[PDB]
Amino acid sequence: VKEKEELIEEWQPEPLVPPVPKDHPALNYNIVSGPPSHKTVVNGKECINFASFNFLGLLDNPRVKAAALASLKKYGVGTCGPRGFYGTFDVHLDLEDRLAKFMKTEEAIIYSYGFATIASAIPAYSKRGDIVFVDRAACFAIQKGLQASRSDIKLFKHNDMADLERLLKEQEIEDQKNPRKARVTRRFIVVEGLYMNTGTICPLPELVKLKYKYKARIFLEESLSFGVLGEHGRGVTEHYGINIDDIDLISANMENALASIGGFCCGRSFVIDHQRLSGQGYCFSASLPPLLAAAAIEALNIMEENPGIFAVLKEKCGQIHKALQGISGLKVVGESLSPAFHLQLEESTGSREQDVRLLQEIVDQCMNRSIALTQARYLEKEEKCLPPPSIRVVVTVEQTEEELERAASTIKEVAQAVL
Amino acid sequence: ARAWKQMSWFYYQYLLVTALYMLEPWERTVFNSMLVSIVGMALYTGYVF
Amino acid sequence: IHHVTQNGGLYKRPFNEAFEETPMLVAVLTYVGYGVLTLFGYLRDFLRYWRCHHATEREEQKDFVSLYQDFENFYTRNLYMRIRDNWNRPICSVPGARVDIMERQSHDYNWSFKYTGNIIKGVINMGSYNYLGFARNTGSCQEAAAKVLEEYGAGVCSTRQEIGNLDKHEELEELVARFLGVEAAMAYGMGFATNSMNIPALVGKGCLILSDELNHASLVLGARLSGATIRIFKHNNMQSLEKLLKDAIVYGQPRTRRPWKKILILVEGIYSMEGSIVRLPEVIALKKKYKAYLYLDEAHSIGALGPTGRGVVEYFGLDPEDVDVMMGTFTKSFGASGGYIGGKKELIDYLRTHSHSAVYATSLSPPVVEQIITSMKCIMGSLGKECVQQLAENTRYFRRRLKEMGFIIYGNEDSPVVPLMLYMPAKIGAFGREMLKRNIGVVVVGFPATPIIESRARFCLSAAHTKEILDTALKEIDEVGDLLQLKYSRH
Amino acid sequence: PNTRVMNSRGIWLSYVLAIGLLHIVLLSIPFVSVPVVWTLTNLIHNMGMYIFLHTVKGTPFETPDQGKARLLTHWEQMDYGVQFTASRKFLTITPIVLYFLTSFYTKYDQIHFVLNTVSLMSVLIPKLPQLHGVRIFGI
Ligand SMILES: *Cc1c(COP(=O)(O)O)cnc(C)c1O
């Protein structure tokens, strides 16, 4: 009846934003005045920083700032339009050529954003029928393309061989179960070369030889592993010395250790062409601003003119990872090679919400001692495998070790005081 | 003289409609032959009746 | 007061949009044009059973289950690959009014290209998002970022809830909130990444989303990532809007019949294709009638509508305090990169915590923040707020001008985007080459991003376009529309 | 995008004239007879409407639904699956009219009954709405 529908109209939905504070999490956006350089100043407190990801330190190079300014005076600032519709520049073409040359591979795409370069690459391939094997502690950017591509994710435990082989044999059961359907499966393997959350490195030769045994496809997501792993810094493939053409897709971003904005995916030209048609963030967003691009080409010039910088970072990892172990109340859960530590606490408390607040105090006292650190935030109710609270330690090449060891000393002191 | 030039415009007009334009002239004449021979068979059977 | 017609949608001005239905004889010829083209594709792929050269999947140690569907790549290699010379042309200058274009060509029939050396100069463009004319490497507006560039650098190596949070970021987030006239604002890295990372932080499992037929790839994608029921209503059809909106409350889910948790609406100000403005007061009047929310997208609309252009809200003269969340970008009027979200302070603070992007993605580059600021300063008061009166003059002049020339134009008449209707797929492939011969570069819109009988071309007007720049383009079009007989309209 | 492709404007009018061209092409053949012209054109039409509706599955382009209708042929995916629509019934009435004119021509012969029925049979059998997703031992 007509009027009865009007009776249902007297109804209230939920208010849009929820009652936000649990106890009082406001998380205190930390104002940094000026450049976040090696000598920076946070909230008016001068300090040196240990979460800024310029591992090469190329944010403070005036070679870069002279290069981008030339691009600024002859191109403008932003591209008025997407990459198809008259939005493709010469430096866009020059940078795609350079990354293929730097990686000795065929092609390299450029996405305008460091996050959506792998959230928009994975759903271009796996599409509702294909099986993806995920190492359960990859970053959140990987964890959304897997949600966007409505394909069944099979997780496996972290950095952990032969539990993945447990899954593979289960599909060999299913391969011989319906061989017509197993002709159309085209399953994939997603691995990150150096994990942002654990700071570990995955065994690729134990995975490449594992690939042909079970006929899968490997997507490398070397974001942190890009930049400084090899002798020239081409990632774990230069580090393990294995062939580039074993890997079906290598992703990264030009933000960690390039001090620019955006991401790229390099690889064999059978696949990199395909994202030009269905990248979903490639052909629907603004292209990369050219002064960021010409900055990033010079960053490639500096990385290619001087490969000796990648040597001094590795041993600088080998000292702060050495000369910090043995301290009570916490644990170093990153490897020696990883320049992004995780320094989570052993002997955990109860509620993590308090455990962050206990971890909050150490970071506050350390910033009072002119040593700036982070707290390594996350999204708890979404992340689908969330790590315990750590704090990240990020080393650069412009660290000047005599003051670097000061930081390890002053955190050896103040940690036990809170604990 | 321009009537031979005006005529090629109508042929060029025939290239746009029914999408003969970007049709790789290796393949266009294949369609031109299937255009001629059907009309060429339309005449020979039409003269019968 | 102009129209208060039935839903309480109070109009001040006349509306005057035009969706001329396509002619009968024109439409039939299109399917023949595709019908011959779909015919040779089966011919061509049949010829490829022996071996224009392909990407050639690695044989070396591969040949697993094959990677791509052969059939899903049908239209990209048989209708796209034929005529892909246009909408991909590299330019080598500032995309202002005249644009230096690098010339390229293919003797392999568009399968592999080649730059000769040539730089085709002084090409009037009408396909760039340069409405208020801020794409220039001159003047004091862009000069201010050079001081910022030599000081700060070109990008934080950090995250907003992590270390990277500059004073400029805190300044700009204030600055837009006064510009929009709302409580608080927050900038993001790129305009695509906004909708794909914040809409899932709002709606949840029990929500219902009422989006338009043709939003964007942004707004669909955010609606996919939030697990939430998505329902499509017809384009600017308030009757079809309310019909879904009625049944959304008097029913619930399909499986259970529980009430919905919350519902909201995804609409845009100026739809890019078929450049038209949403019937906004009929939406504000309807969401108050049904307690729905409203997500609005001023990607094209801001800097283009209203006096001293502040989006469609000032263009309808309405209040910013009835739109629950406002989003727009900085690439499409300001000559910058990124986007914002405007809203209530309670909303912004929830999104300063649950963001997907302030907590994972790195933030803006410092100098492009300055390019946003100085551009808004020239708007708020130096090439300033006189150009929006120029563009609306340029809009209204150019919109009547092609309509009386026998062409067919969609959308509202005051909309700066000019959708020009092709219909035949060969007329797509000729027109981009044809205008490029006449020293003008435009944007043609293909088949799958349209319906079948739309296949249009598109013009972006600009305040940087003067009258002589505009009328010279009017002269060139007069020949081509004659040359291709694309004079479809009756009036 | 293959869900509004028969729900477009004048596609019904253009579907007739393709057959109307195909008959006049088949009418002007020398060594043929005016019964087996109609026999031929009811065979070819019902061959096309099987291969272009009930055999090829997916889209010629790329679907942003992550390939939901990758396993679905073109008839199954019209109008997002709602069967009794304004355009599926037009596609079922039309071979029947092509059955009755080929019933009218050939003068109701026995071999022209046999050959022109099983084409009309094998096209309507998949168009049973209760035969939505069942596929006979293949495809
Ligand atoms: C421009 C556009 C986008 C893409 O965002 P940008 O960063 O500006 O490229 C998203 N949504 C709409 C409606 C757009 O027009």
Report which DSSP code applies to A267. E
Instruction: Provide the terminal-to-terminal Cα distance of chain A, rounded to the nearest Å.
Output: 69
CA angle C415, C468, C395 (to 5 degrees): 10
How many B-D residue pairs are in contact by the CB < 8 A criterion?
11
In this structure, what is the dihedral angle of CA atoms A60, A63, A66, A69, given to the nearest 10 degrees?
-70
Q: Is B3 helix (H, G, I), strand (E, B) or coil?
A: helix
Q: Which of C332, C356, C427, C465 is catalytic?
A: C332
Q: A189 with A207: CB under 8 angstroms? A: yes
Q: What is the CA radius of gyration of chain C?
A: 24
What is the three-state SS of chain C? Answer: CCCCCCCCCCCCCCCCECCCCCCHHHHHHHHHHHHHHHHHHHHHHHHCCCCCCCCCCCCCCCCCCCCCCCCCCHHHHHHHCCCCCCCCCCECCCCCCEEEEEEEECCCCCCCCEEEEEEEEEEEECCCCCCCCCCCCCHHHHHHHHHHHHHCCCCCCCECCCCCCEHHHHHHHHHHHHHHCCCEEEEECCHHHHHHHHHHHCCCCCCEEEECCCCCHHHHHHHHHCCCEEEECCCCCHHHHHHHHHHHHHCCCCCCCCCCCCEEEEEECEECCCCEECCCHHHHHHHHHHCCCCEEEECCCECCCCCCCEHHHHHCCCCCCCCCEEEEECCCCCCCCCEEEEECHHHHHHHCCCCCCCCCCECCCHHHHHHHHHHHHHHHCCCCCHHHHHHHHHHHHHHHHHHHCCCCECCECCCCEEEECCCCHHHHHHHHHHHHHCCEECEECCCCCCCCCCCCEEEECCCCCCHHHHHHHHHHHHHHHHHCCCCCCCC
- For the CA of C332, the nearest atom of ligand 1: 8
Q: Taking a C-beta distance cutoff of 8 angstroms, is the pair A339, A392 a contact?
A: no
With tokens 């790195």, the residue in question is C362
In the Cβ-directed half-sphere of D101, how many Cα atoms lie within 13 Å?
14
Which single residue is written with the structure tokens 């035949």? C424
Task: Identify the H or E element spanning D118.
Answer: helix D111-124
Q: Which atom of ligand 1 lies at the shortest distance from residue C216's CA? A: 13
Other residues' Cβ atoms within 10 Å of the Cβ of residue A76: 27
Contacts C356 to A, Cβ<8 Å: 140, 144, 379
What residues pair up with C295 in beta bridges, in sequence order? C266, C325
Please report the resolution in angstroms: 3.8
Token pair listed for A248: 């079906």
What gap in Å lies between CA A418 and CA A362, rounded to an integer? Answer: 7
Quote the distance between the C-alpha of residue C430 and its chain's center: 24
Residue showing tokens 């730097």: A102
A254 CB-side CA count, 13 A: 30
Method: cryo-EM
Q: What is the dihedral of CA A9, A12, A14, A19, to 10 degrees?
A: 170
Half-sphere exposure of A340 (CA within 13 A, CB side): 28
Containing domain of residue A169, as a range?
62-305
Sheet with C417-420, edge to edge strand ranges:
C417-420, C457-460, C443-444
Q: Which two tokens stand for residue C363?
A: 């933030």
Q: C332 an active-site residue?
A: yes
Q: How many of the other CB atoms lie within 10 Å of CB of A410?
A: 15
User: Which residues are registered as beta bridge partners of C114?
Assistant: C105
**Do B16 and C427 count as a contact with CB atoms less than 8 A apart?**
yes
Alpha-carbon torsion (A180, A214, A176, A162), positive or negative: negative
Closest CA to C372 of C340, C350, C348: C340
> What is the Cα Rg of chain B in Å?
14
Question: Is A137 within 8 Å of A195 (Cβ atoms)?
Answer: yes
List all residues 6 or more positions away from C115 whose beta carbon is below 8 Å from its beta carbon: C102, C103, C104
CA distance D98 to D108: 14
Quick check: B17 contacting C, CB < 8 Å?
A: yes
- Cα C398 to Cα A119, C206, C403, C459: the distances in Å are 41, 47, 9, 10
Q: Are A396 and A379 in contact (CB under 8 A)?
A: no
Dist. CA C167–CA C184, nearest whole Å:
16
Neighbours of A270 (CB within 10 A): 18
CA of C127 to the centre of ligand 1 (A): 15
Q: What's the sign of the alpha-carbon dihedral A276, A278, A279, A280?
A: positive
Residue C482 backbone phi and psi in degrees, to 5: -70, -40
Whose CA is closest to C75, among D77, D62, D71? D62
Cα–Cα nearest to A285, from C278, C332, C159, C76? C332
**DSSP 8-class letter at A371:** E
Q: Which residues pair with A266 in a beta bridge?
A: A108, A250
Of C151, C157, C259, the CB nearest to A255: C157
Contact A147 C225 (CB under 8 A): yes
Give the number of other CB atoms < 10 A from CB of residue D25: 14
3-state secondary structure of D91: helix
Residue C338 Cα: closest atom of ligand 1: 7
d(CA A202, CA A204): 6
Which residues of A sit within 8 Å Cβ distance of D? 123, 127-129, 148-151, 277-278, 280
Residue A190 structure tokens: 């997603």
- In DSSP terms, D57 is beta-bridged to D73
Q: Which long-range contacts (CB under 8 A, 24 or more apart) does C276-279 make?
A: C276/C17, C276/C236, C276/C410, C276/C411, C276/C412, C276/C415, C277/C17, C277/C301, C277/C305, C277/C312, C277/C315, C277/C411, C277/C412, C277/C414, C277/C415, C278/C212, C278/C236, C278/C312, C279/C9, C279/C15, C279/C236, C279/C238
DSSP 8-state class, residue A387: P
Q: Give the distance, in angstroms, between the CA of residue C231 and the centroid of all CA atoms in the same chain.
A: 21
Q: Which two tokens stand for residue A298?
A: 């010079």
Q: Is the Cβ atom of C160 under 6 angstroms away from ligand 1? A: no
Report DSSP state, residue A345. P
Among all chains, which residue has been given the structure tokens 């082989």?
Answer: A165
Nearest Cα neighbor of C450 from C16, C22, C4 is C22
Pick among D59, D63, D66 to test the A interface (most A CBs inside 10 A):
D66
The structure tokens listed for C4 are: 């208060």
- Identify which of B21, B27, B31 has the shortest CB distance to residue C430: B21
d(CA A303, CA B20): 52
Residue A246 has which token pair? 């074993």
Q: Is the CB of C236 under 6 A from ligand 1?
A: no
SS3 state at A188: strand
Alpha carbon distance B46, B33 (integer Å): 19
Residue whose tokens read 């040593």: A371
Degrees to nearest 5, angle at CA D116 with D111 and D119: 135
Sign of CA dihedral A147, A149, A152, A155: negative
D91 φ/ψ sector (left φ>0, alpha ψ -120 to 50, else beta): alpha
Q: Which of C24, C423, C425 is nearest to D13 (CA)?
A: C24
* Distance in angstroms (rounded) separating the CA atoms of residues C286 and C284: 5
Catalytic residue among C169, C300, C356, C465: C300
* Residue A117 near residue A111, CB atoms below 8 Å: yes
Q: What is the CATH number of the domain that holds A185?
A: 3.40.640.10
Phi, psi of C466 (to 5 degrees): -85, -170
- Identity of the amino acid at A114: G
β partners of residue A188: A132
Q: Residue whose CA is closest, atom 15 of ligand 1? A: C299
Q: How many CB pairs under 8 A join A and C?
A: 305
Contacts of D29 in chain B (CB under 8 A): 41, 45
Q: A147: nearest CA in chain D?
A: D66
Which residues does D89 contact at the CB level (< 8 Å), separation at least 6? none
State the helix-helix crossing angle for C366-380 and C139-151, rounded to 10 degrees. 150
Query: C192 in ligand 1 pocket by Cβ < 6 Å?
Result: yes
Supply the residue whose CA is at minimum distance from atom 12 of ligand 1: C299
Residue A254 is classified by DSSP as S
Cβ count within 10 A of residue B36? 11
C184-206 burial, b if ≥16 CB within 10 A, otherwise e? Answer: bbbbbbbbbbbbbbbbbbbbeeb
One-letter amino acid for residue D31 of the chain = F
Burial of D71 (0-12, 13-18, 19+ CB in 10 A): middle
Tokens 């109508």 label which residue? Answer: B10
The neighbouring-strand residues paired with C123 are C99
Residues 6+ apart with CB under 8 A from A351: none
Give the one of B38, B44, B46 whose C-beta lies nearest to D25's C-beta. Answer: B38
Residue C23, judged by CB atoms within 10 A of its CB (0-12, 13-18, 19+), counts as middle
Is any ligand 1 atom within 6 A of the Cβ of residue C268? yes
Please check whether residue C298 is in contact with residue C326, taking contact to mean a CB–CB distance below 8 angstroms.
Answer: yes
Give the angle A8-A11-A16 at the CA atoms, nearest 5°. 145
Contact yes or no for C427/C447 (Cβ under 8 A): no
Q: Are C12 and C317 in contact (CB under 8 A)?
A: yes
Residue closest to D60 by CA, chosen among C74, C345, A418 = C74
Contacts D32 to B, Cβ<8 Å: none
Q: Which residues in chain D touch residue A129, judged by CB atoms under 8 angstroms apart?
A: 67, 70
Task: Return the sign of the alpha-carbon dihedral for residues C135, C138, C144, C150.
Answer: positive
Alpha-carbon distance of A399 to A52, in angstroms, equals 12
Q: Give residue for tokens 């002053």.
A: A410
A286 CB less than 6 Å from ligand 1? Answer: yes
Residues of C in contact with B31 (CB under 8 A): 36
- Quick one: CA torsion of D66, D71, D74, D76, rounded to 10 degrees? -100
Which residues fall within 8 angstroms of residue D52, CB to CB, at 6 or more apart? D74
Are A343 and A330 within 8 A, CB to CB? yes
Residue type for C345, please? Answer: K
| Nearest of C4, C49, C336 to residue C187 by alpha carbon | C336
Look at strands A132-134 and C114-125 and give their pairing: unpaired
Tokens of C6: 């039935």
| 8 Å CB contact between C226 and C219 | no
Please answer whether residues C461 and C332 qualify as being in contact, where contact means their C-beta atoms are separated by less than 8 angstroms.
Answer: no
Any atom of ligand 1 within 6 Å of the Cβ of C332: yes
- Count CB neighbours of A287 within 10 A: 27
As a whole number of angstroms, the distance between CA C19 and CA C77 comes to 32
Rounded Cα gap, residues D49 and D42, in angstroms? 11
**DSSP code, position A194:** B
Here the tokens at position C474 are 């009017």
List of long-range contacts for C307-314, beta carbons under 8 Å, 24+ apart: C307/C388, C307/C389, C308/C379, C308/C380, C308/C385, C308/C388, C309/C132, C309/C333, C309/C379, C309/C388, C310/C179, C310/C180, C310/C181, C311/C180, C311/C269, C312/C269, C312/C270, C312/C277, C312/C278, C312/C280, C313/C280
Range C137-143 contact pairs with CB under 8 angstroms and sequence separation of 24 or more: C137/A72, C137/A73, C137/A74, C137/A75, C137/A76, C137/C94, C139/C383, C140/C374, C140/C382, C141/C371, C141/C374, C141/C375, C141/C378, C141/C382, C141/C383, C142/A72, C142/A76, C142/A77, C142/C371, C142/C374
C419 beta partners: C458
The kind and range of the H/E element at A167 are helix A164-175
Q: What's the rounded Cα separation, in Å, for the pair A369 and A47?
A: 8
Which three-class secondary structure state does DSSP give residue A286? Answer: strand
Ligand 1 binding pocket includes C188 (Cβ within 6 Å): no
Q: 3-class DSSP state for residue A264?
A: strand
Where does residue B18 fall: left (phi above 0), alpha (psi -120 to 50 degrees), or beta otherwise?
left
Query: CA nearest A315: which of A337, A331, A341?
Result: A337
According to DSSP, the residues that pair with A132 across neighbouring strands are A153, A188
Whether C412 contacts C449, CB under 8 Å: no
DSSP B37: H
Answer whether A189's CB lies under 8 Å from A206's CB: no
Spatial distance between the Cα atoms of A60 and A399, rounded to a whole number of angstroms? 13
* SS3 call for A43: coil
Min distance B2 CA to chain D CA atoms (Å): 35
Residue with tokens 């294995």: A242
Q: Report the distance separating Cα A105 and Cα A107, nearest Å.
A: 6
Residue C300 bears catalytic tag: yes
